[model samples]
Target chain A: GTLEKKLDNLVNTILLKAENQHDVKLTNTQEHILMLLSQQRLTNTDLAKALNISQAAVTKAIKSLVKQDMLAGTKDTVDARVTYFELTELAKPIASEHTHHHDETLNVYNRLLQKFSAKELEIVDKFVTVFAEELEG
Target chain B: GTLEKKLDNLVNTILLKAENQHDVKLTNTQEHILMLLSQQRLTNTDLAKALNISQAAVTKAIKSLVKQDMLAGTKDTVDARVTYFELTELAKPIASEHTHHHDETLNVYNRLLQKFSAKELEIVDKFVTVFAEELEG
Candidate 1:
C-alpha cells in the first residue's frame, strides 16, 4: 500500500482507540468539527469551507451536537442572522484531547527532524511537496 | 499542520475532484468498499475488520451499494449462512481508478527513493516507523 493509504488507515485506527480511551464517542465529522473549533469558533459557512464538506452535512452535525449539548451557537451581534458555533464546556476536554493527539504527532515529526541533516531534510521536504502536488493535481 | 493532516485534507480534495471527473458520486465509505472488494470477495465480517468500522455501518453501506448495483453478494456453496460480496461490473472501473491513484503515489515514492542513499533512506524509513508507533501507542 502507499504511505498515504497506510496513514489513512492508521489515522482511523488511532482515532477509534482514542475514542475508546476517552469514552467520548463521536462520528469522524463531529470529532473533526470539535477539533477545528478548539482553535476558534466558526460559522456554518466558514466550517463548510474549512472542512470541505457540504453545508447541509455541517448543519446536520451541528444540530446533533447542539442537541447533545456538545456545542453552543452564538449569534453575531452585528449580524444576528449569522450564528457561530463553539464547543460547550462539556465538549472542551474532548476537543483538547483531539488537538493533543495532533500536537503529539507533530512533536514526533519534530523529534525525527533532529536526526537528519539539513540537506537530507530538504530532499524529504521536496519529496513531501511533490507527493502533495501529485495527489492534488 | 502535521503531514498526516495535510495529506488527509488533500486526499479528500482529490477524491472530490475524482468524483467530478468520473461522473461517479460516492461517499468515502462507499468508494472504499468498492476499492476493497476489487481486491477480492469479502464477508461482512471481513469488511468490518478491514474498514475498522462497526458491522452495522458496513451492513448499511453494503445495503446502499447493492441498491446502487455496485456490489453483488454470493452465498458460500459449502455454508449457506455465509455471504461474500464482490464488486459488480459497473463498479470495476471506479475501483480501478482508485487503485490507480494509489499506484501512482507509490511510483512517486519509488522515484524519490532513487535520489537518496541507503543511509538517508534508512533514516526516513525509521522516521516513518517511529511516527506510526507513536500514533499507535
Candidate 2:
C-alpha cells in the first residue's frame, strides 16, 4: 500500500510537471491521437479503430495537428482515399527532446528492477509486453 | 536481457503513444505552473523558486488559469501579500477524467501481472514502487 501510494504520487507529479513543462499544450483528445501517431504512421481509419473513436473525431484531431504543424499528411501514392500521417521535421526535434526527457523518467524505473531476482524480472518483462499489447488492442 | 528488452519496449511503446496521443499545447510557462500547482498550492514566491521562472510568468499563468476557471486564487486574510492556489471544481473534474483515461491505459499493465506468481508479483510491486520513487527524486 505504501508503494502503491508512492507510485501514484510519483506518476501524478510527473504528469503534472509534464503538463506544464511544455513546448506544446494538448487537449485530452489531441494527446491520445499523438500517442497513436508516434507509434506508427497510419491511415485515419486505423487510428480511429485503435482509439475506439469515430472517424470524424480522428479527422478532427488530424486537422488540428496539421494546422499546428506537428504532422504532415500525404495521400497514399497507390490509394487516393488513404492518407498517411507522419511527424514534421519540426515535430521530430520536439519529439526527440521530449523523448530524452521521458527517458530520464524511465531510467528511474529501470534502476528499480535491480531489486528483483532474475525470474521475477522475466515475469515483469512478459507482463509489460502483454500490458502494452492489450492497450494497443 | 529479456526483462530489459521488455521494459524498453513497454516504456518505448507507452511513451511513443503518450507523446503522440497528446500534443504539448501548453506553453513552457503554463506547463511549469500547472506542475507546481499539481504538487501543492503555493504563493507567488513559492512558485518562482520551484519553477525557476520569473514572478511575472507565474503571475501570468495564475491569471490565465483563474480566467479559464482552472485555478482559484485567494489572498490570505491575515497576510494580504500571500496568495494561495488550488484547483477549481471545474479543473478537478477535468483532471479526474484525464486520470481515469490514464488508469484505463495502466490497467493493461495490471492485466499482464496476472500471469506472475505471488513471489514475482511481490518483486514487481516492489520494483515499480522504487522506480516511481526515483522518478520523483
Candidate 3:
C-alpha cells in the first residue's frame, strides 16, 4: 500500500511540475492529441479515427495546440483537404524537457526498489507492468 | 529503446482512453489543481500558494469545478474567510475509475516483463523509478 501510494504521488507530482515547467496547459483531449502527434504525424481525420473521437473534437484540440505554437498544421501537397500536423520546433524542446523530468522521477522509484531483493523487485515489476497494460485494454 | 518506446506508448494510450471514458475534460489549470488536490485538501489561498498562480486563477478554477459538481468549497464555520475544498461524490467515482484503468495498464507491462530475468527487471525498475523521481524534483 505504501509503494502504491508512493507511485501515485510520484506520478501526480511529475505531471504537475513538468506541465508547469513547459507551460503546456492542456485539456485531456489536447493531451491525447499531443501524445498521438508525438508518436507520428496525424491529420485531423486520422487522429479522430485513431482516438475514436469526433473530427470536430480533433479539430478543436489541434486548433488550440496550433494557437499555442506547439503544433503546426499544413495542407498535404497531394491533397489540399488533408492536413498534416507535426510538432513545432518550440514543442520539441518542451516535450524533451518534460520527458527528461519524467525519467528523473522514475529514477526515484528505481532507487526504492533497491530496498527489495531481486526476486521481490521482479515480482513487483511484473505486477506493475501487467497492471498497466491490462488497464489499457 | 524498444522497452522505453513501448512503455511510453502504453502509458499514453491508457491515460488518454481513461480520460475519454470519464469524460473528464480539464483545462490546464484544472488539471494542475486536480493533481494538487489528489495529494491533499487545501484552502483557496493554500492552493494559490502551492501552484504559485494568481489567486484569481485559483478562484476561477475552483469555481469551475464547483459548478461542474466535481469539487465543493465550503467556508469554515470558525473562519468565514477560509474555504476548504474536497472532491465531490461525482469526482470520487470518476477518479476511482481512472485508477482502476491505470492498474490494468500496469498489469500489461508486468506480463511483458516475463521475457526478462529477475535481475534485469530489477535494473529496469530501478531506472524508471529513479528517472520518475528526478523529474518531480
Find the candidate with the highest TM-score and give its number. 2
Top candidate (lDDT): 1
Q: Model 3, range B39-88, lDDT digits (tens) per residue?
A: 67888888877766568778888888888988977778998888888887
Instruction: For residues B1-137, write the lDDT of model 2, one tens digit per residue.
Output: 44554654454444334444452244445544655576587888898766554677678777877778788888899999888988776676555655565566455444566577777777767667665555445
The CAPRI classification for model 2 reads as incorrect
Q: Per-prediction TM-score of chain B? A: 0.69, 0.55, 0.53
State the lDDT of candidate 3 residue by residue for A1-137, as single tens digits.
33344454444544454334446667656766776687788888889887666787788788888899999878889888888999988887766655575476455554565566776655655555664555555
Q: What tens-digit string does per-residue lDDT give for candidate 1 at B15-66?
A: 3333323355566667777878898889998987876667877888889889
Q: After superposition, how far is residue B90 of candidate 1 from its true place, in Å?
A: 6.0
Tell me the tens digit of each residue's lDDT in model 1 across A45-88. Answer: 89877766678878988898898899999899998989999988
**Which parts of model 1 are misplaced by more than 4 Å?**
A1-25, A45-60, A129-137, B1-33, B36-85, B88-137
Task: Flag clash pairs in model 1.
Answer: none
Residue lDDT tens for model 2, A20-136: 444466554565566567778898889877665568877887888889998998888888988999887767765665556556646655567777778777666765666557645
lDDT of each: 0.69, 0.64, 0.65
TM-score per model over all chains: 0.54, 0.56, 0.48
Which 10-residue span in candidate 2 chain B carries the lowest summed lDDT?
A: B15-24
Q: What is the lDDT of residue A62 in candidate 2?
A: 80
